[PDB]
Ligand binder design. Structure first.
Ligand SMILES: Cc1cc2nc3c(=O)[nH]c(=O)nc-3n(C[C@H](O)[C@H](O)[C@H](O)COP(=O)(O)OP(=O)(O)OC[C@H]3O[C@@H](n4cnc5c(N)ncnc54)[C@H](O)[C@@H]3O)c2cc1C
Ligand SMILES: Cc1cc2nc3c(=O)[nH]c(=O)nc-3n(C[C@H](O)[C@H](O)[C@H](O)COP(=O)(O)OP(=O)(O)OC[C@H]3O[C@@H](n4cnc5c(N)ncnc54)[C@H](O)[C@@H]3O)c2cc1C
Ligand SMILES: COC(=O)c1ccccc1S(=O)(=O)NC(=O)Nc1nc(C)nc(OC)n1
Ligand SMILES: COC(=O)c1ccccc1S(=O)(=O)NC(=O)Nc1nc(C)nc(OC)n1
Ligand SMILES: Cc1ncc(C)c(N)n1
Ligand SMILES: Cc1ncc(C)c(N)n1
Ligand SMILES: [K+]
Ligand SMILES: [K+]
Ligand SMILES: [Mg+2]
Ligand SMILES: [Mg+2]
Lengths: 582, 596
């Protein structure tokens, strides 16, 4: 090819973005990356979103990718610019989010001299990228860009980093540049044999446009109840009777009980992380027993060999794209008419273990769980497409439990790394991906404080995001652990919040606040109906634990369920131990 | 052996080690993996705990605290995102040699390598930006690792170190005695070698005719640094120039002061360096923002060296920075201050240097820090604000500490402020981290409760970490935040104006209402736009008790000059010229379609 000859490395970058079908780029300029910013000045090949902090660009790109299905592209400078995107990269690495991060670097002749704004970005990002590299020459630039996008979007999607020395991007190109089938059958037999099967679905099913469809097909065909992980929410319609909801540490008791009593667990695009399995040795006993008798066990539809048999020994492993392999064994699955025995047990659990919690009473404070339920309906009553992002903590768990998920790619949350401050920037990026959607960020006060500077970025990008802050004036998830395992010793978990409404107004947004239950319903209406970016602060009760809960050495079936009397005794104890402070 | 810790948890042992290491302040943010340690320091009276809204804030606060106190900054954050959030501050401290010990919680040892919840390979991530790091494998070695961390961070060239703390290690109870040495916090040939290099250095200095002391941060790493630097300067009549990180080490009120050298340094300083026959480098690393085109650096010193009558003497503590950028004739290893003390008696007292000084005074009159001053109806000039604030702050009689963001405002603060006291300028130089200003100011205020702490910030820099505004309120640190608002990434637009034909690619951001932001955060907000209101607002600013933010609307697209860039030598600098600034303005309006 000789179409690039005569162009600078930066101009080649501009063209390559076009070839990769990039329509949006998130970044912050800086000295080392100036040659690239000059070549993309007023570019019409893609839109550009400017944050206030590189961490924002990073999280914005993640939200964008998770909502659009396309890799998020980041463009920052060297030194601090690159170190500032490490968290987003580690975050995208843990959740398998496709992201291509371009970092400006000092001239190749300055590298290794402790140069101005120089960092060993390739070394620093090594553990949090599927692959990274430093471009040495302009003739090598197109190849590295093409490899970066390919790697980031194949296998298990993930982040990649391309280091761009200033002299390389300023340089002008002169010279023209140049068994599974067996596993599928063995897996189908086991399924046809299962008496109490359960579908354990994860983020993997959402990595293919036809994932949700085939999942439903297999579920309806063989009548198999489906439970999903935090990252799997949205892949299955929770309206369907076969829905077990979310499993794990803070999952539905029914979901966890089903998994513990199942003779066959079909793992689809899930990695059995420690937030799901509970005590690994106590995980899926019935499945282990069934496997011992050659009448069940665990089937794993995983794309990455290294996640196979990593946490728990499986009986059958189907390597490759889950959606693809499911479509292949569909014809090898005997249609199941009914499962009265299995379904009877599950329905009994449902009625027995619902998402119970201390509901409001005359004069009491608004309850966080209630806000989620109400907001879920109101948002749905708009008919608009809905995408929800969140921060990290109790509010995140409650948003997961009390919202009714039915559409894929509508829940964007930080799971593996659990990065506080993810909500706002991720929502902004998601809004850019789906301009027509009603993007809502269900945030916590502590999380919000982390990246609240991006509020002005929302206004500058023209993203009418709705920011909901469940303010319990505490780092709730940590405080819950201190209450439960640390004799109510709240060590540095209560920060001083700024006036959120005045903050919103200062940032150029509309601010709303709710204190009384009598105003919640109306405020929620106005919130979702407001045109443009808006922030709604809802004062919710404090020291409210997320239940059920499976922690420590407890098995998924040994969960701590809600009990009104226990909460009351806990409140009295908390008061006595904190001197009536909490 | 030592059995005094038997029965204690790792967290409790940690708490105990802090007081043994003389730690009076800890900056941190709690999280799951680090809970055992947080439970152990709950209500501890061994030290004041400072809580930010973001771990990056904790890191920068710790740096500002260290730079102002001379003590290592201690950070305590959780695993995963908590640790990755402090990578910038560590890389920042690594670049500027700031002593800091970062403690990051970690998942249980049995969960490491399983892609556990909130797990990150922090020792791998931080290896290139710490002097040393380690992951404590058992509670038995916790005291050992803590002592090694503080020792390493505070010796040689100070820097950051990271200690990874697995949750099971900190929650574990020590059930085995441990070596007493691990719990408790020279060569005759080398000394004679150093003295020999000192005698060689003295000999070279005694024959110099046009000497120049090039002083950096190293001189401030010792309490007697400034004093000895002054004694040597007076004894041998040697003019003194400092790097950005050396500002405050030499009284700029002294006639022998040359001010700052480098890319944006005083022309006199740069000219003195280009014509000196001897350059006595004291605690400076010849970085690329100082030397200009290296092959054009100190030509007269290179010539004197070739003739065996001069060259470069380097007082450096780290072997890594000896003969790294330029060939030096005599390297004096070790603490600069200490070595200057040993060398003093070998220095011949000098009556005077008429010719040398006359030449320098000639350059001073010809090349002052000139710029376009205000005119009727024009916006306030950033340089003018600095000069006015400098005098208002100095006249208070209080001890003043200045922190900054990164950019033009940073350079103008360095040039136009009158530096006289050590450890009063706290700025990010090597890595140049925008957003450093506020958190660093809070940290410095904590270190020096009686000091008037001022953060001279840029609008873009301030936006990076403005969430720490509420932290200042919660911490009780009455920091004075000054925002020189030009509504642009000034330092970048300056480069775009000079080398990219005024093409401002994504360097203009939409700012929030700073005064309303300040008040929303819980502090007093002030704004000034008119020239005649500047004096009164600055007075109100520094006189306000409590944290306060003052936004000053300043002119836009104003370049920082002098400027040495590209392949230019320190003497081939661009100087301020009113006609040129006018022509540039005209060219800019046309090229940007009147937008800028
Ligand atoms: C406060 C907090 C509480 C939490 N509580 C819970 C909880 O109670 N319950 C819970 O479920 N989670 C919880 N989590 C989230 C949790 O940490 C994990 O992030 C999440 O469970 C991982 O879900 P996943 O396995 O589905 O997705 P991932 O972690 O992304 O793993 C996906 C798996 O699918 C594979 N795969 C990917 N793409 C494909 C493809 N195309 N074809 C085939 N296979 C593919 C991957 O390589 C991998 O093995 C919590 C997190 C936080 C922050
Ligand atoms: C926008 C921008 C513009 C800049 N412009 C300029 C400019 O024009 N001029 C300028 O000077 N800088 C400028 N800088 C800062 C610059 O990048 C360097 O950070 C600074 O010059 C380094 O100064 P230093 O060498 O004194 O300190 P350091 O970088 O900290 O280096 C100190 C040196 O002293 C040694 N040393 C340390 N302790 C001791 C001891 N006890 N005894 C003996 N030796 C010791 C070290 O190990 C090292 O080699 C700029 C930065 C930015 C962000
Ligand atoms: C970023 O540094 C490098 O990449 C870098 C690092 C070491 C040597 C030379 C460079 S450079 O000569 O090619 N570019 C450069 O110096 N750029 C730059 N951009 C801005 C906007 N401000 C300032 O300096 C105040 N410098
Ligand atoms: C941080 O993770 C680990 O260190 C971690 C990682 C993998 C396995 C086990 C742990 S743990 O069992 O020892 N602690 C733990 O899980 N803590 C914790 N703390 C809070 C405040 N919230 C939540 O979970 C929602 N978990
Ligand atoms: C943190 C940060 N982002 C961008 C630039 C240019 C800088 N100096 N620092
Ligand atoms: C960024 C960040 N800091 C602290 C905790 C606990 C978290 N989940 N994320
Ligand atoms: K639900
Ligand atoms: K000065
Ligand atoms: Mg909260
Ligand atoms: Mg500015």
């Amino acid at each position: 090819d000789t179409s690039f000859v005569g162009l600078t490395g930066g101009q080649i970058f501009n063209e390559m973005m076009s070839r990769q079908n990039v329509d949006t780029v998130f970044g912050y300029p800086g000295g080392a990356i100036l040659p690239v910013y000059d070549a993309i000045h007023n570019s019409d090949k893609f839109n550009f979103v400017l944050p206030k902090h590189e961490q924002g660009a990073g999280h914005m790109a993640e939200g964008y990718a998770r909502a659009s299905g396309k890799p998020g592209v980041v463009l920052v400078t060297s030194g601090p610019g690159a170190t500032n995107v490490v968290t987003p990269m580690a975050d995208a690495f843990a959740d398998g989010i496709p992201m291509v991060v371009f970092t400006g670097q000092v001239p190749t002749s300055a590298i290794g001299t402790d140069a101005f704004q120089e960092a060993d970005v390739v070394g620093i990002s090594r553990s949090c990228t599927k692959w990274n590299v430093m471009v040495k020459s302009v003739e090598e630039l197109p190849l590295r860009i093409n490899e970066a996008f390919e790697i980031a979007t194949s296998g298990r999607p993930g982040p990649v980093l391309v280091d761009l020395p200033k002299d390389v991007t300023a340089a002008i190109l002169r010279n023209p540049i140049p068994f599974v089938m067996q596993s599928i059958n063995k897996a189908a037999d086991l399924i046809n044999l299962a008496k109490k099967p359960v579908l354990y679905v994860g983020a993997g099913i959402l990595n293919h446009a036809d994932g949700p469809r085939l999942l439903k097909e297999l579920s309806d065909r063989a009548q198999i109840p489906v439970t999903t992980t935090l990252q799997g929410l949205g892949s299955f319609d929770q309206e369907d009777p076969k829905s077990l909801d979310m499993l794990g540490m803070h999952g539905c008791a029914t979901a966890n009980l089903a998994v513990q009593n199942a003779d066959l667990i079909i793992a689809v695009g899930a990695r059995f992380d420690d937030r799901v399995t509970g005590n690994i040795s106590k995980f899926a006993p019935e499945a282990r027993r069934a496997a011992a008798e050659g009448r069940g066990g665990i089937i794993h539809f995983e794309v990455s060999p290294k996640n196979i048999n990593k946490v728990v020994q499986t009986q059958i492993a189907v390597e490759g794209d889950a959606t693809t392999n499911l479509g292949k064994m569909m014809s090898k699955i005997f249609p199941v008419k009914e499962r009265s025995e299995w379904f009877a047990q599950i329905n009994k659990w449902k009625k027995e273990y619902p998402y119970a919690y201390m509901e409001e009473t005359p004069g009491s404070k608004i309850k966080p769980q209630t806000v989620i339920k109400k907001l879920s309906k109101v948002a749905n009553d708009t008919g608009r497409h809905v995408i929800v992002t969140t921060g990290v903590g109790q509010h995140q768990m409650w948003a997961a439990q009390h919202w009714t998920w039915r559409n894929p790619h509508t829940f964007i949350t930080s799971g593996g790394l659990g990065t506080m401050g993810y909500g706002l920037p991720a929502a902004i990026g998601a809004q850019v991906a789906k301009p027509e959607s009603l993007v809502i960020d269900i945030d916590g006060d502590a999380s919000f404080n982390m990246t609240l500077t991006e509020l002005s970025s929302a206004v500058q990008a023209g993203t009418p995001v709705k920011i909901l802050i469940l303010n319990n004036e505490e780092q709730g998830m940590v405080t819950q652990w201190q209450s439960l395992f640390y004799e109510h010793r709240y060590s540095h978990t209560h920060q001083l919040n700024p006036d959120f409404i005045k903050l919103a107004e200062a940032m150029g947004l509309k601010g709303l606040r709710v204190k009384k239950q009598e105003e919640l319903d109306a405020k929620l209406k106005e919130f979702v109906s407001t045109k443009g970016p808006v922030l709604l602060e809802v004062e919710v009760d404090k020291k409210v634990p997320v239940l059920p809960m499976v922690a420590g050495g407890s098995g998924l079936d040994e969960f701590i369920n809600f009990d009104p009397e226990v909460e009351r005794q806990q409140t009295e104890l908390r008061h006595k131990r904190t001197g009536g402070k909490h």
